[PDB]
Amino acid sequence: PHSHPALTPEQKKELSDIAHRIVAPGKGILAADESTGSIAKRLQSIGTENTEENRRFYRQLLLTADDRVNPCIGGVILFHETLYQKADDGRPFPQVIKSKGGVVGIKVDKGVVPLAGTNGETTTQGLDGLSERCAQYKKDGADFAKWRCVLKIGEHTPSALAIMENANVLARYASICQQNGIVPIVEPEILPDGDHDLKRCQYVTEKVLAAVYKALSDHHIYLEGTLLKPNMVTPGHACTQKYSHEEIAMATVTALRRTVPPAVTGVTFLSGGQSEEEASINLNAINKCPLLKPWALTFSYGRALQASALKAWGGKKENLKAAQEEYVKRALANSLACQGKYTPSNHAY
Amino acid sequence: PHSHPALTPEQKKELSDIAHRIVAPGKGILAADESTGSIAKRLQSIGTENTEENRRFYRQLLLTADDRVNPCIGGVILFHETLYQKADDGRPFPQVIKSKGGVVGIKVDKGVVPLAGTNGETTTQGLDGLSERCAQYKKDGADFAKWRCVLKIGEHTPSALAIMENANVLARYASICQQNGIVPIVEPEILPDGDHDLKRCQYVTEKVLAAVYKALSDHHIYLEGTLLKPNMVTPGHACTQKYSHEEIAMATVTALRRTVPPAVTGVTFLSGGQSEEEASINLNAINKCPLLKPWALTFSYGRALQASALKAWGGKKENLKAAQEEYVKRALANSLACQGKYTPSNHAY
Amino acid sequence: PHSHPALTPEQKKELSDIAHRIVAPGKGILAADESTGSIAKRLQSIGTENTEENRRFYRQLLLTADDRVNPCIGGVILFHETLYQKADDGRPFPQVIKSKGGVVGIKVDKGVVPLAGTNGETTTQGLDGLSERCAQYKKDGADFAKWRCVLKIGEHTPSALAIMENANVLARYASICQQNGIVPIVEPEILPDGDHDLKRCQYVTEKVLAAVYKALSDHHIYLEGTLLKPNMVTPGHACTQKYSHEEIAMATVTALRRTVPPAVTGVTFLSGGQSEEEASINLNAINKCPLLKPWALTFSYGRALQASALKAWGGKKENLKAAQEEYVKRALANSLACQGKYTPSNHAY
Amino acid sequence: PHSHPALTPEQKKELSDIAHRIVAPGKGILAADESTGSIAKRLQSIGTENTEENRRFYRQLLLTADDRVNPCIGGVILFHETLYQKADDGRPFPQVIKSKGGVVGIKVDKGVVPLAGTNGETTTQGLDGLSERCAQYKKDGADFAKWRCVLKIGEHTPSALAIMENANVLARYASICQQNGIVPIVEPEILPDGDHDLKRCQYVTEKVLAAVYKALSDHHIYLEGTLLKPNMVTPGHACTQKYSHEEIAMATVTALRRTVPPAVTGVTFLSGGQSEEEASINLNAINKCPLLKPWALTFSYGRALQASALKAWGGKKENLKAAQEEYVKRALANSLACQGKYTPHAY
Ligand SMILES: O=P(O)(O)Oc1ccc(C(P(=O)(O)O)P(=O)(O)O)cc1
Ligand SMILES: O=P(O)(O)Oc1ccc(C(P(=O)(O)O)P(=O)(O)O)cc1
Ligand SMILES: O=P(O)(O)Oc1ccc(C(P(=O)(O)O)P(=O)(O)O)cc1
Ligand SMILES: O=P(O)(O)Oc1ccc(C(P(=O)(O)O)P(=O)(O)O)cc1
């Protein structure tokens, strides 16, 4: 029952200022941190060989887009490899991002592993040596980080063990990040797979997020220096009932209002399986929801910002500006959506 | 991980409507629910005998003040006895309250009991047969309830057992109230006794409230149909260090922003040991605090609304209007304070 | 992390001595504590009116059986009414029990109540005023108590909430009993209803018992002064697969070896839906199970000791000796079974 | 509320048989798994240079003692390096251990790390890639593993966070081991530092162990295929009050009887700060305690088995026979103590 402060006032200020910079009005996050296994599939989807040089070129493609994205992008998440690559002009990518007014982020988790005794559930590893990696990433230009936990809605899932363990590892990761001046993004993703309906996803999301923020409290996490990266509340991919974007927005906002303390600086949704345009409408509806939302509601999009750019690129160097244009389109679209400015019964929740 | 709805949409709307009526702008709660053992202390302090008649008269004195209190008082909490008494004009007190535009509340707990193996810590009893009582109180005009848990800041307290146990019984009480159409006020009071400083009270309050709302989630409580009745974050009564009202307001709003989900309809502060004027000033500073506060921040005052009325009464029949005037003063003062309209480095928190 | 002892060594000795007397070798408990609503059903099965006198006579019939039961019955559980009734010769029933070498027990819970938001699950009430009741029961001759919690195996049950809440209320009850020199019997009954198999029951029983003993630790319960009243591990009533008595015994002892600390003085199984002969055979098989069992394994039987006696009685005063003989037969049978002397691989668990 | 079995019956049998071999009557564990930084302190204490060869030689010294230790030693815990070193006759140390009737163990954690917001409390790291390491150690002859968590008795410690977090990481480590056919030794150590008395240690030990076994239940651990490595219940190093060996035994057995389920196969005590003889006397008292003890109560000793051997060696190759004799003495002493045959309600 006695306080042994984890952070000084100066440390708290740095973390709060970083978090606010990332989700400042009209701004969101580009998730360009696809692991080397995940980036392989993207390149194979456009028949391009997965070489370090192709990965560098594609990342450079997104980071050097014209200055129209500067007011759209508050932060860019990178994979380890990309953090130490350089643009053609010799500038390290963290410097490119900074010079366009962005914060640099680093994904630090090491993937999921199975939880024995469960119905195919997982936790996430990566805590070993994390403090030294974070101190190193801080030196090399990173100011926030990402850690992804995965949960699945099934007949017996997510179980009490899975929720508790994923919530606990998220808190540990957040604790280590804040000790090294890094803002942790807490991502408890509930997959959209299955035939569950909207209200079931809302129920599960509410139970996961309540576990998350109890754990963050237990581990003394400074919420003003955190961000939340949740799934939107949506029906399962295999659900037959159809829902309006207004219903998606109402259920999403409702789940957050019931679990996310106001001290959290911002919520940066993941797009999941949504299409580029679907992810922009939904995010816009969420910001038009009449209910009171005491946190920034913006984006941390990977595919929903890159899908078109990747295809217009096709691996051909001469399609550089055509691909950048598709990326700039989505960045401008979602900069409007996270302000509710995008145009192409609460008791029931 | 499967939903079995505790409340229908129609039940939710009733509870939410009640909760909002109570904390509507400019309105607060009169706490006239002193148990017969506590009201005995009040009458003794003005040398008045503790008879049912004096208790009935004293309550009548407050409930029948002139219509300047109608926009100030959203709700009145009563003890069991008073709920079935009548004013001099024969009208049952619940009818008097409603006719003046107030909601009727009832205290339903049966006092504290010791927790074996702890250093003088307690839990609260009163769950047995609570559902049938609630159904009866509902019929007889009550629309919300009160339950008081007490925690103490000390060398080894509040302990993990004390926090877990009091949070859990509050959730049981709230669950039963909502099944019977009654809005539960959740009151986990941290006593101001001791020489602890402001930061220690803020730390305990943040830990206690995190446990409360995790327990409310585990028990499926509908937060829009609840109110929270917490202490303000203050130093101990015996703390040597001095603090401004702005500092108390900053500590209080920070603790709440870090724990209370936006879905909670209102926060009705208890006055504790504060004087009448001190309680109104602090509530006013709380409502002027620049930070974002997504709930109503109003009052549930007993002593802070009654102290002057009681002394002016003194048991004399002829001092009725002198006493009623002192109560109308405090009702008007606190109606202004809960709007920030009353005049007599956040990272360091 | 600081001990504030709940009990003195003298208090500990008293509780431990009571507990060992009850489950001394060859001894078990007669459960004659049916509520007036539960005993009414039994009387109706023999077309006998539910009057206080018939209830008195029936209880007298059991309590005054001939002295062949004295070494069989270490304790007798009574309902409130029966604790204050007298035999025909004027002797209070507690004195009847004590003079035959038994300990007097009292049922102290006030029945189950529904948990809102669950699939028909319950918790139990009765804590209100329990401390005053226990001290009074102690004065009037009772030395141990019983509290029944009920959990159900279903598609989504027992839930996390139901396990947590019932474990917590059992520990509260146990703490209060021990403060008044009363040995608590902790009864977390998992019902046999449903089509579940033996493995499913063993799993649930293991998780229930683990939660029970964690709660008892959190509440500072003295295990040597407690007894456990669990179900045997059995298939559901509606299960099609058939199991031998040796498999039931192996599953039961395995579940217990994995969850019950050796400090627990004894285990007094409930019979559930089992017949008189079935409950005796299983208990015998349990005590012959080759595994190591560091606690007494005996019986706390109601129907499995009374069924034949109740039928032979039929309400007729003249069937006294015929009825008593049937009760004595089962008491002698079960006294042999709890020693493994009654006659009418493990890695797969 | 639905079972998804973590282990098959075949997997349970393998784990149970391993665990029973390690703690078979008269047998205990030699803890020779000192990390490279801890063994550096040991060698420095006898003015010996910390070289791979010196570490190899010292470990060989212990593992090749004469066959009088065979009935005393059910298991040997090794550090990663030693697992892949060889004796002078070319045999890998795991083969040496097995040929003398012992089971090979491996330390798999990666040290303690601070818990932010606490008063100097720690958790332990080492889960990343533990499944692949365990599978590899199994191929290379290891059949059980060790993971150490450390807790401290202070004015505000151990806190709810530290107990919960350490209990949870222990359960994760135990879960991964059992999926790879390795018996986990669960070691939640409460340090003897401080001026606390016996009662305080008994209280803390009971709370820590209750949390450990709830965690292990939550994570579906097969207790019959696990071992416990706890401290003995003793007063703090700086406590003025004196206690007899019978009181230490009574407090230790009582703590265990109130927390450790009978299904656990064995309890292998750590020696902590105790001298070789103090550890042997206390272990003997524990095994003679009149209360009923449904698990093997033996030793997992490092310093309490090696102290005299290290000093008799002194780094000199010609003291090989002298050093080995001192080790065989303690192995014989403690093999008797864990049978209770060694002689030189208030809880
Ligand atoms: O679902 P897919 O179509 O296979 O594509 C994926 C899958 C997972 C991820 C993860 P990772 O980078 O850790 O692999 P994250 O979304 O957290 O970046 C990224 C892209
Ligand atoms: O501090 P005191 O001078 O003793 O006055 C008191 C003490 C307690 C209460 C309780 P109760 O009504 O349950 O007794 P509550 O604040 O909940 O009304 C009310 C007034
Ligand atoms: O099995 P049934 O036919 O429904 O009869 C019953 C049902 C419940 C009980 C309870 P109670 O006495 O508290 O009501 P307990 O098992 O605790 O004696 C006793 C007999
Ligand atoms: O107390 P010291 O004098 O510092 O010696 C020590 C300290 C710690 C250990 C650990 P480690 O080998 O993991 O560091 P373990 O007890 O687990 O072997 C071993 C020896």
PDB file of N, CA, C and O in Angstrom, chain C residues 1-3 9 12 16 155 158 200 203 207 210 217 220 222-224 257-258 260-263 294 347 349, chain D residues 1-3 9 12-13 16 155 200 203 207 210 217 220 222-224 257-258 260-263 294 345 347:
ATOM      1  N   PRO C   1       2.424  -8.027   3.845  1.00  0.00           N
ATOM      2  CA  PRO C   1       3.290  -9.183   4.103  1.00  0.00           C
ATOM      3  C   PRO C   1       3.604  -9.363   5.586  1.00  0.00           C
ATOM      4  O   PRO C   1       4.583 -10.028   5.934  1.00  0.00           O
ATOM      5  N   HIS C   2       2.779  -8.771   6.446  1.00  0.00           N
ATOM      6  CA  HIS C   2       2.969  -8.826   7.888  1.00  0.00           C
ATOM      7  C   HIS C   2       1.799  -9.560   8.522  1.00  0.00           C
ATOM      8  O   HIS C   2       0.636  -9.259   8.230  1.00  0.00           O
ATOM      9  N   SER C   3       2.116 -10.518   9.388  1.00  0.00           N
ATOM     10  CA  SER C   3       1.098 -11.319  10.049  1.00  0.00           C
ATOM     11  C   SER C   3       0.479 -10.540  11.200  1.00  0.00           C
ATOM     12  O   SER C   3       1.190  -9.971  12.034  1.00  0.00           O
ATOM     13  N   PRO C   9      -2.645 -19.559  19.811  1.00  0.00           N
ATOM     14  CA  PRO C   9      -2.392 -21.011  19.872  1.00  0.00           C
ATOM     15  C   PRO C   9      -3.488 -21.778  20.592  1.00  0.00           C
ATOM     16  O   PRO C   9      -3.816 -22.905  20.196  1.00  0.00           O
ATOM     17  N   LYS C  12      -6.256 -22.147  18.205  1.00  0.00           N
ATOM     18  CA  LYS C  12      -5.894 -23.147  17.206  1.00  0.00           C
ATOM     19  C   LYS C  12      -6.067 -24.557  17.761  1.00  0.00           C
ATOM     20  O   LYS C  12      -6.637 -25.432  17.101  1.00  0.00           O
ATOM     21  N   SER C  16      -8.454 -27.501  16.144  1.00  0.00           N
ATOM     22  CA  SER C  16      -7.844 -28.742  15.674  1.00  0.00           C
ATOM     23  C   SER C  16      -8.395 -29.950  16.422  1.00  0.00           C
ATOM     24  O   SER C  16      -8.663 -30.994  15.818  1.00  0.00           O
ATOM     25  N   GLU C 155     -22.508 -26.155 -20.430  1.00  0.00           N
ATOM     26  CA  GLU C 155     -21.737 -25.784 -21.610  1.00  0.00           C
ATOM     27  C   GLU C 155     -20.845 -24.582 -21.323  1.00  0.00           C
ATOM     28  O   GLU C 155     -19.709 -24.512 -21.809  1.00  0.00           O
ATOM     29  N   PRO C 158     -19.164 -24.304 -14.715  1.00  0.00           N
ATOM     30  CA  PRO C 158     -19.206 -23.095 -13.886  1.00  0.00           C
ATOM     31  C   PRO C 158     -18.274 -22.003 -14.405  1.00  0.00           C
ATOM     32  O   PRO C 158     -17.166 -22.290 -14.856  1.00  0.00           O
ATOM     33  N   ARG C 200     -14.448 -34.797 -17.222  1.00  0.00           N
ATOM     34  CA  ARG C 200     -14.920 -33.424 -17.086  1.00  0.00           C
ATOM     35  C   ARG C 200     -15.187 -33.083 -15.627  1.00  0.00           C
ATOM     36  O   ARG C 200     -14.840 -31.991 -15.165  1.00  0.00           O
ATOM     37  N   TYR C 203     -11.876 -32.618 -13.847  1.00  0.00           N
ATOM     38  CA  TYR C 203     -11.291 -31.327 -14.195  1.00  0.00           C
ATOM     39  C   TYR C 203     -11.936 -30.203 -13.390  1.00  0.00           C
ATOM     40  O   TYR C 203     -11.247 -29.440 -12.705  1.00  0.00           O
ATOM     41  N   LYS C 207     -10.301 -27.565 -10.485  1.00  0.00           N
ATOM     42  CA  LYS C 207     -10.249 -26.109 -10.562  1.00  0.00           C
ATOM     43  C   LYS C 207     -11.034 -25.474  -9.421  1.00  0.00           C
ATOM     44  O   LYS C 207     -10.601 -24.472  -8.840  1.00  0.00           O
ATOM     45  N   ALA C 210      -8.931 -25.846  -6.167  1.00  0.00           N
ATOM     46  CA  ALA C 210      -7.777 -24.951  -6.170  1.00  0.00           C
ATOM     47  C   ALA C 210      -8.196 -23.526  -5.831  1.00  0.00           C
ATOM     48  O   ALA C 210      -7.526 -22.839  -5.053  1.00  0.00           O
ATOM     49  N   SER C 217      -6.536 -19.322   1.874  1.00  0.00           N
ATOM     50  CA  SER C 217      -5.241 -18.754   2.235  1.00  0.00           C
ATOM     51  C   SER C 217      -5.312 -17.233   2.298  1.00  0.00           C
ATOM     52  O   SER C 217      -4.813 -16.618   3.244  1.00  0.00           O
ATOM     53  N   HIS C 220      -6.702 -16.042   5.524  1.00  0.00           N
ATOM     54  CA  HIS C 220      -5.984 -16.403   6.747  1.00  0.00           C
ATOM     55  C   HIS C 220      -6.691 -17.518   7.516  1.00  0.00           C
ATOM     56  O   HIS C 220      -6.769 -17.492   8.743  1.00  0.00           O
ATOM     57  N   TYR C 222      -7.224 -21.216   9.092  1.00  0.00           N
ATOM     58  CA  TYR C 222      -6.399 -22.239   9.734  1.00  0.00           C
ATOM     59  C   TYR C 222      -6.900 -23.600   9.266  1.00  0.00           C
ATOM     60  O   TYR C 222      -7.933 -24.089   9.732  1.00  0.00           O
ATOM     61  N   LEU C 223      -6.161 -24.218   8.340  1.00  0.00           N
ATOM     62  CA  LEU C 223      -6.658 -25.410   7.665  1.00  0.00           C
ATOM     63  C   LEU C 223      -6.799 -26.592   8.614  1.00  0.00           C
ATOM     64  O   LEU C 223      -7.698 -27.423   8.436  1.00  0.00           O
ATOM     65  N   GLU C 224      -5.926 -26.700   9.616  1.00  0.00           N
ATOM     66  CA  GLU C 224      -6.032 -27.818  10.544  1.00  0.00           C
ATOM     67  C   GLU C 224      -7.336 -27.772  11.325  1.00  0.00           C
ATOM     68  O   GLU C 224      -7.776 -28.807  11.835  1.00  0.00           O
ATOM     69  N   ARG C 257      -5.661 -35.269  -4.198  1.00  0.00           N
ATOM     70  CA  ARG C 257      -4.213 -35.213  -4.026  1.00  0.00           C
ATOM     71  C   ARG C 257      -3.612 -34.005  -4.729  1.00  0.00           C
ATOM     72  O   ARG C 257      -2.547 -33.520  -4.331  1.00  0.00           O
ATOM     73  N   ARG C 258      -4.270 -33.510  -5.771  1.00  0.00           N
ATOM     74  CA  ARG C 258      -3.752 -32.406  -6.561  1.00  0.00           C
ATOM     75  C   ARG C 258      -4.155 -31.033  -6.039  1.00  0.00           C
ATOM     76  O   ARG C 258      -3.671 -30.028  -6.566  1.00  0.00           O
ATOM     77  N   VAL C 260      -5.799 -30.489  -2.292  1.00  0.00           N
ATOM     78  CA  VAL C 260      -6.088 -30.329  -0.869  1.00  0.00           C
ATOM     79  C   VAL C 260      -4.775 -30.428  -0.095  1.00  0.00           C
ATOM     80  O   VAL C 260      -4.142 -31.492  -0.115  1.00  0.00           O
ATOM     81  N   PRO C 261      -4.336 -29.372   0.588  1.00  0.00           N
ATOM     82  CA  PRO C 261      -3.099 -29.471   1.355  1.00  0.00           C
ATOM     83  C   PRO C 261      -3.222 -30.529   2.437  1.00  0.00           C
ATOM     84  O   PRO C 261      -4.319 -30.762   2.977  1.00  0.00           O
ATOM     85  N   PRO C 262      -2.116 -31.189   2.791  1.00  0.00           N
ATOM     86  CA  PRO C 262      -2.184 -32.215   3.845  1.00  0.00           C
ATOM     87  C   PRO C 262      -2.635 -31.684   5.193  1.00  0.00           C
ATOM     88  O   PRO C 262      -3.128 -32.465   6.017  1.00  0.00           O
ATOM     89  N   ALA C 263      -2.460 -30.390   5.458  1.00  0.00           N
ATOM     90  CA  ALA C 263      -2.848 -29.841   6.750  1.00  0.00           C
ATOM     91  C   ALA C 263      -4.345 -29.965   7.001  1.00  0.00           C
ATOM     92  O   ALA C 263      -4.772 -29.933   8.161  1.00  0.00           O
ATOM     93  N   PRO C 294      -3.198 -38.243   2.789  1.00  0.00           N
ATOM     94  CA  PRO C 294      -2.814 -37.732   4.108  1.00  0.00           C
ATOM     95  C   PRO C 294      -3.946 -37.126   4.922  1.00  0.00           C
ATOM     96  O   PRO C 294      -3.667 -36.429   5.901  1.00  0.00           O
ATOM     97  N   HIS C 347      -1.898 -42.793 -14.542  1.00  0.00           N
ATOM     98  CA  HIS C 347      -1.462 -41.727 -15.435  1.00  0.00           C
ATOM     99  C   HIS C 347      -2.542 -41.326 -16.429  1.00  0.00           C
ATOM    100  O   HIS C 347      -2.389 -40.301 -17.101  1.00  0.00           O
ATOM    101  N   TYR C 349      -5.385 -40.316 -15.471  1.00  0.00           N
ATOM    102  CA  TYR C 349      -6.192 -39.332 -14.757  1.00  0.00           C
ATOM    103  C   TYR C 349      -5.464 -37.999 -14.679  1.00  0.00           C
ATOM    104  O   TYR C 349      -6.090 -36.946 -14.568  1.00  0.00           O
TER     105      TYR C 349
ATOM    106  N   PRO D   1     -14.140 -23.717 -18.663  1.00  0.00           N
ATOM    107  CA  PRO D   1     -14.593 -24.843 -17.838  1.00  0.00           C
ATOM    108  C   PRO D   1     -14.547 -26.173 -18.586  1.00  0.00           C
ATOM    109  O   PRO D   1     -15.116 -27.173 -18.130  1.00  0.00           O
ATOM    110  N   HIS D   2     -13.876 -26.172 -19.735  1.00  0.00           N
ATOM    111  CA  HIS D   2     -13.718 -27.358 -20.563  1.00  0.00           C
ATOM    112  C   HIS D   2     -12.245 -27.729 -20.603  1.00  0.00           C
ATOM    113  O   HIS D   2     -11.386 -26.859 -20.779  1.00  0.00           O
ATOM    114  N   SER D   3     -11.960 -29.017 -20.432  1.00  0.00           N
ATOM    115  CA  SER D   3     -10.586 -29.494 -20.418  1.00  0.00           C
ATOM    116  C   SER D   3     -10.075 -29.684 -21.837  1.00  0.00           C
ATOM    117  O   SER D   3     -10.735 -30.314 -22.670  1.00  0.00           O
ATOM    118  N   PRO D   9      -1.495 -39.377 -21.453  1.00  0.00           N
ATOM    119  CA  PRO D   9      -1.047 -40.308 -20.403  1.00  0.00           C
ATOM    120  C   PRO D   9       0.400 -40.742 -20.568  1.00  0.00           C
ATOM    121  O   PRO D   9       1.140 -40.827 -19.579  1.00  0.00           O
ATOM    122  N   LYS D  12       2.540 -38.015 -19.277  1.00  0.00           N
ATOM    123  CA  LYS D  12       2.493 -37.966 -17.819  1.00  0.00           C
ATOM    124  C   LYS D  12       3.368 -39.054 -17.211  1.00  0.00           C
ATOM    125  O   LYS D  12       4.140 -38.799 -16.278  1.00  0.00           O
ATOM    126  N   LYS D  13       3.263 -40.279 -17.729  1.00  0.00           N
ATOM    127  CA  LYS D  13       4.071 -41.376 -17.205  1.00  0.00           C
ATOM    128  C   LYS D  13       5.554 -41.040 -17.271  1.00  0.00           C
ATOM    129  O   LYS D  13       6.295 -41.250 -16.302  1.00  0.00           O
ATOM    130  N   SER D  16       6.340 -38.387 -14.631  1.00  0.00           N
ATOM    131  CA  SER D  16       6.254 -38.920 -13.277  1.00  0.00           C
ATOM    132  C   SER D  16       7.429 -39.841 -12.973  1.00  0.00           C
ATOM    133  O   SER D  16       8.021 -39.767 -11.890  1.00  0.00           O
ATOM    134  N   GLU D 155      10.147  -4.451   4.879  1.00  0.00           N
ATOM    135  CA  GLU D 155       9.024  -3.765   5.509  1.00  0.00           C
ATOM    136  C   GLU D 155       7.805  -3.749   4.593  1.00  0.00           C
ATOM    137  O   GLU D 155       6.668  -3.854   5.065  1.00  0.00           O
ATOM    138  N   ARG D 200       7.642 -14.836  10.922  1.00  0.00           N
ATOM    139  CA  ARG D 200       7.490 -14.034   9.713  1.00  0.00           C
ATOM    140  C   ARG D 200       7.859 -14.841   8.475  1.00  0.00           C
ATOM    141  O   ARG D 200       7.173 -14.766   7.450  1.00  0.00           O
ATOM    142  N   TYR D 203       5.099 -17.332   7.728  1.00  0.00           N
ATOM    143  CA  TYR D 203       3.968 -16.641   7.120  1.00  0.00           C
ATOM    144  C   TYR D 203       4.235 -16.346   5.649  1.00  0.00           C
ATOM    145  O   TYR D 203       3.425 -16.686   4.780  1.00  0.00           O
ATOM    146  N   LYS D 207       2.314 -17.863   2.190  1.00  0.00           N
ATOM    147  CA  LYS D 207       1.648 -17.035   1.188  1.00  0.00           C
ATOM    148  C   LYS D 207       2.279 -17.214  -0.190  1.00  0.00           C
ATOM    149  O   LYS D 207       1.567 -17.316  -1.196  1.00  0.00           O
ATOM    150  N   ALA D 210       1.245 -20.718  -1.570  1.00  0.00           N
ATOM    151  CA  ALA D 210      -0.153 -20.755  -1.984  1.00  0.00           C
ATOM    152  C   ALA D 210      -0.332 -20.065  -3.328  1.00  0.00           C
ATOM    153  O   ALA D 210      -1.127 -20.509  -4.164  1.00  0.00           O
ATOM    154  N   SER D 217      -1.928 -24.277 -10.973  1.00  0.00           N
ATOM    155  CA  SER D 217      -3.248 -24.794 -11.312  1.00  0.00           C
ATOM    156  C   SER D 217      -3.836 -24.037 -12.493  1.00  0.00           C
ATOM    157  O   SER D 217      -4.363 -24.643 -13.434  1.00  0.00           O
ATOM    158  N   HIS D 220      -2.387 -25.277 -15.719  1.00  0.00           N
ATOM    159  CA  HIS D 220      -2.613 -26.680 -16.080  1.00  0.00           C
ATOM    160  C   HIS D 220      -1.353 -27.530 -15.912  1.00  0.00           C
ATOM    161  O   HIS D 220      -1.091 -28.427 -16.711  1.00  0.00           O
ATOM    162  N   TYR D 222       1.074 -30.383 -14.406  1.00  0.00           N
ATOM    163  CA  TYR D 222       0.916 -31.745 -13.890  1.00  0.00           C
ATOM    164  C   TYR D 222       1.840 -31.891 -12.685  1.00  0.00           C
ATOM    165  O   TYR D 222       3.051 -32.073 -12.836  1.00  0.00           O
ATOM    166  N   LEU D 223       1.264 -31.801 -11.479  1.00  0.00           N
ATOM    167  CA  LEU D 223       2.072 -31.697 -10.265  1.00  0.00           C
ATOM    168  C   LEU D 223       2.895 -32.952 -10.014  1.00  0.00           C
ATOM    169  O   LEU D 223       4.011 -32.864  -9.491  1.00  0.00           O
ATOM    170  N   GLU D 224       2.359 -34.121 -10.360  1.00  0.00           N
ATOM    171  CA  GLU D 224       3.109 -35.358 -10.204  1.00  0.00           C
ATOM    172  C   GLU D 224       4.398 -35.347 -11.021  1.00  0.00           C
ATOM    173  O   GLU D 224       5.336 -36.079 -10.690  1.00  0.00           O
ATOM    174  N   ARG D 257       2.971 -28.366   4.748  1.00  0.00           N
ATOM    175  CA  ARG D 257       1.727 -29.103   4.915  1.00  0.00           C
ATOM    176  C   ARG D 257       0.507 -28.236   4.635  1.00  0.00           C
ATOM    177  O   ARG D 257      -0.551 -28.770   4.286  1.00  0.00           O
ATOM    178  N   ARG D 258       0.629 -26.919   4.773  1.00  0.00           N
ATOM    179  CA  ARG D 258      -0.488 -26.011   4.571  1.00  0.00           C
ATOM    180  C   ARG D 258      -0.599 -25.505   3.142  1.00  0.00           C
ATOM    181  O   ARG D 258      -1.545 -24.770   2.838  1.00  0.00           O
ATOM    182  N   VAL D 260       1.452 -27.294  -0.010  1.00  0.00           N
ATOM    183  CA  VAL D 260       1.949 -28.120  -1.109  1.00  0.00           C
ATOM    184  C   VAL D 260       1.036 -29.337  -1.256  1.00  0.00           C
ATOM    185  O   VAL D 260       0.958 -30.151  -0.324  1.00  0.00           O
ATOM    186  N   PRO D 261       0.350 -29.507  -2.387  1.00  0.00           N
ATOM    187  CA  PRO D 261      -0.554 -30.645  -2.528  1.00  0.00           C
ATOM    188  C   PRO D 261       0.197 -31.958  -2.461  1.00  0.00           C
ATOM    189  O   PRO D 261       1.367 -32.047  -2.878  1.00  0.00           O
ATOM    190  N   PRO D 262      -0.452 -33.025  -1.983  1.00  0.00           N
ATOM    191  CA  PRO D 262       0.222 -34.334  -1.930  1.00  0.00           C
ATOM    192  C   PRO D 262       0.675 -34.850  -3.284  1.00  0.00           C
ATOM    193  O   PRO D 262       1.559 -35.716  -3.337  1.00  0.00           O
ATOM    194  N   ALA D 263       0.082 -34.371  -4.378  1.00  0.00           N
ATOM    195  CA  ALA D 263       0.433 -34.876  -5.698  1.00  0.00           C
ATOM    196  C   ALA D 263       1.847 -34.487  -6.106  1.00  0.00           C
ATOM    197  O   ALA D 263       2.443 -35.164  -6.947  1.00  0.00           O
ATOM    198  N   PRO D 294       3.549 -36.165   2.868  1.00  0.00           N
ATOM    199  CA  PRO D 294       3.259 -37.051   1.732  1.00  0.00           C
ATOM    200  C   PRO D 294       4.130 -36.814   0.506  1.00  0.00           C
ATOM    201  O   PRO D 294       3.760 -37.216  -0.601  1.00  0.00           O
ATOM    202  N   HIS D 345       0.601 -26.314  17.500  1.00  0.00           N
ATOM    203  CA  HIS D 345      -0.444 -25.301  17.377  1.00  0.00           C
ATOM    204  C   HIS D 345       0.122 -23.897  17.565  1.00  0.00           C
ATOM    205  O   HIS D 345      -0.568 -22.906  17.326  1.00  0.00           O
ATOM    206  N   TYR D 347       2.378 -22.837  15.678  1.00  0.00           N
ATOM    207  CA  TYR D 347       2.861 -22.503  14.345  1.00  0.00           C
ATOM    208  C   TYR D 347       1.702 -22.115  13.430  1.00  0.00           C
ATOM    209  O   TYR D 347       1.896 -21.442  12.417  1.00  0.00           O
TER     210      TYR D 347
END
